[PDB]
Structures are given as structure tokens and as C-alpha cells.
Amino acid sequence: AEEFPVPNGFESAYREVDGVKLHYVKGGQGPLVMLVHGFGQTWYEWHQLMPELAKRFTVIAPDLPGLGQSEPPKTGYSGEQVAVYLHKLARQFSPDRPFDLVAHDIGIWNTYPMVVKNQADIARLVYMQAPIPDARIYRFPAFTAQGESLVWHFSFFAADDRLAETLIAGKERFFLEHFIKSHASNTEVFSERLLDLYARSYAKPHSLNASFEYYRALNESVRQNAELAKTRLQMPTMTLAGGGHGGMGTFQLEQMKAYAEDVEGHVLPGCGHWLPEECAAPMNRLVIDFLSRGRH
């Protein structure tokens, strides 16, 4: 059964990539755009953008390895390892043209290495609401004068003893509602049904573990990216970030300036971390307009 409802004109499907069965939802015609979700979510976070984008592009939205309906990786959870799966999956559908890439939260972690190593394959790039793993993440504070900080969960999720799985099992719905709303400006967009669907998905034991294995590999990803970042990104890039509670603010664009020669950025006031849901309409417009400057 499908964990989330598939939009009209799209298909839910699977492809084996290096022995790992990846789930994705695909529709549209034209050059390929791959949309990569982040923590706590699945392909479904893109379900409002996908039909609009499908008017000019072939759109594919995979579930990250181990999350949604995708099998766990058989290599590992570091950015370079996961990016192989996403790169090869995209190339099955766009072998002869470069494709566009849009990524949210840890979707950035899981795609940056294949972008930087296969630049001729990437037409345009959109990154939103997460640092690329590098030394800048070691500067975020553990605690703020207003209470809990933006990324203390990096340490919670990366802790050993399966600390996060053990404390959250049996409380998956409670924890996901807290985490989503603590990083949101607009909490009203998260209906009880929507939270039910996301919680059901990541409560699968292999998905709950997969969720935190991305963070247990974060320092390895930082170390990997320290070598990769010697090559600058040359393709047109756009960053988006929330300006409200939970948002990265100016950090997203300022970090990307060190990685990309050709980058434009927007900060969305009144929006937090969950841009495709909290601020669906303006986020959709900025992405569509940015991608539609290319051939379509």
C-alpha cells in the first residue's frame, strides 16, 4: 500500500540501484527535475509543487534510502554514499541531458557530493533549509537565550546506544509533532492527518533507525566534503530559507556563496523550516521561475 496519496497524473514506482530498491513518484514531460526530501518527511512533502512543475518538466521525487518506501542503503549513510544512489537513479531517467536538482534539509547532505563530482550532469540547483555539511555546523549554539536552539538535535540524533530510537519508539507521533512545530513558523499547515501519515512512515523500525543514521554519518560527511569543496560549483544555483522561527535566515545564501560562483538567494519572512508546506505558494513560484529560465 502507498504511505501517501499519489497526485493525479503521477505514478508510484521502484527502481533497483546498486542492489537497493528505491521508491519514487514520477510524472510530467520534458527535462528532468529531481526533488529530494529531508528528515521527518518523504517524497510527499513535494506533492503540491509536483503537479505545477509537471507542466514543463519530468518530475521525480524519490524516498531517501531507508525512509518512506525505499530500502536502506547497502553501503552507508554518509553523503558520498547516499549520493551515488540518487545520482544513478536520476541518470536512469535522464541519461542524455543534464537534470535539475531541488533539495530540502538532509536532502542537501545526500546530494551535494554527486553535484560537485558530476557537474556536467546538473543543469540548475536549488537548495533550501540546511547547511551543506562543513565546519560551519560546529559554530551553531547548543542553547539560546530564548530556549532550545536550531540544531541541538544534531547531537541527539548522532548519539550512540541508539539513544534516539530507544527514547522515541512508542512516542513517534508525539516526537514528530514536537520537532515539526518547534522548527515551524506556521504550524497550522500540519493537520492531524498529515502528521499521522508522516509519523506512520518514519515509525517503521528500519526507517526510524535510517532517520538517525544520516546524523550518525554527519561528521564523516563533513570530512568527505572538505575534500570535495576544493572544486567550486559552476551551475546556476538558488538558495531558499525561512526568515521566521525555525528558518536558517541569511546563513543559507552566505554559505552557498563559498560553494557556488553563480548563486541567488531568498529569505522568506514569516516562514520556518518546512518551506514546501509552511509557505507552499511563494516557494513553488520561486522554484518554478528559477528552473524555467532553462530549457523546458
Next chain:
Amino acid sequence: AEEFPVPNGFESAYREVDGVKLHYVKGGQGPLVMLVHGFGQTWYEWHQLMPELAKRFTVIAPDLPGLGQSEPPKTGYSGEQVAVYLHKLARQFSPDRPFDLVAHDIGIWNTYPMVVKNQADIARLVYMQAPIPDARIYRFPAFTAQGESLVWHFSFFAADDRLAETLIAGKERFFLEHFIKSHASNTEVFSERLLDLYARSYAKPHSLNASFEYYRALNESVRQNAELAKTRLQMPTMTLAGGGHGGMGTFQLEQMKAYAEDVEGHVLPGCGHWLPEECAAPMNRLVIDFLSRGRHH
């Protein structure tokens, strides 16, 4: 009933202070020293040091409000509120003479206001393994390249919706073994038997909640101390910190220099956060020697 075994010659007792029943263990003779435990623990963390100190001092080790066998505070959990209870308790047993103070972890938070507001009541001071609440705590990292972030649990414990109690209830023994060992260098001293004792105490629902209310009041304590720290501490002070995994390192002394005119500091190599248990012999020696510079039995 007693949650932890009382050392031979000591008594476990209770004293009502401003409507709150405080548990403490007391023994010895001579000038008073009060030992104040921190998070995850109770008076019992001092149980190896207490018999040695009691040869020269009257020793009292209270349970912080809401923890161990002490009732929760009635005012609040900010450092200035809790310090009233501890100051009044100490002065019940030393009403006409200054007393010594040793504090670990959030025992610092819960004593610093009464030290700075009643300086003539404190003869000598020993602080170990925690920042005094001030703006420096906003500078610690959420995530580190090596090891683990020392204070990311500040945000976890301070989070609203009772996040920490809701996740940890029923899993207190698992969580306490993880938190203690992740902040330790010499993990082998935390036997399953010792962890069982500590976990049973803080698993009492009101103690689990009290544990996190100290962190939910931390920003209030920072704001309080911004005013209080306009007067430096004048009495002899010593800081201790672990140099190993989980230790504060040089931060403990460096911050204390901003608070105290007369301070000496030690970093204990190969020791983490839990100095009384991980490094009992050097820590006990440092504390006994420092306090014995003052008059004693």
C-alpha cells in the same frame, strides 16, 4: 526508607525550610561544610568524601529540591529561588559562623546566588564541572567534530511540551546510563549496581520532572546572575574540572576568574564530568586540603 546507604556514623534526616521538606545526610564535628550534588545524582555522590571530611568538619549533604528524597521547591527552580532553601538549611546548623561550600554541576547554579548575596556566610568555596549561568553558555556548540557536545542537553531538557519527561519516562535507567557514561572518562566506575541506585531515585515522577525544571529555569538564572555578578566573590575559591572526555577543561577556572578575586583551579587528567566517582583519590585530596587551610576540628 533510604534510597542510598548512609555511611557509618552519619544520619539521614529532614528539615522543613520555607514549607519544603529537604532531605540531607549529616555527620562529623567542627565547622560546617555543605556538599551540593548535581543532575542525575543525589547526596550519595559525596559518600566517599564525607567520612574523610567528617574527621575535621560537620558535613551536610542535602538532596536538591525535588531530587533524591527532597520535596520540590514551592517558589521555583531558578538559581536564586533554590539558593534560598540551601542557604537557610545551612544556617540552621551554622547560625553564628560562616560555613564551607562544595558544589557539582547544577549544584553551582543552585548555590551561586546565596554565595554572592551572603558573602560573609561563606568561608571557602569549591565549584566543579559546570558553568555558572551567564552569557557564556550561549557560546557552547550544539555539535562537535570530535567527541560530543557537552551541553546540547540544555536544549533537550529545556524544551517545552514536557519533551524530555515524555520521552524518558519508563526508560530512565537506560537514559541515565547513557548520559552518565557519555560524560565520563573512567566509565568503569559506573557499575550496573550503582546506576540502578541512581536511576531508581530520579525515576520518581516528581524527580524526573524536577530534574528538567532546573534547565527550564536556566535562562531565568542567567538573567538573575547578570545583576548579581556586579559584585565579585571575595572568599577563597577553588575550581575543579575533568581534563578527559566530558570534562570542562580550562573553562571552569577561566570563567571563575571573572567571578572571584581569589581562585585556584585544577584540571584532573583522565577524568570526565563525575569527579567524585571517576577520580575519587585526587579529587578528595584536593578538596580536603583546600578546606583544611581554614580552621577545622
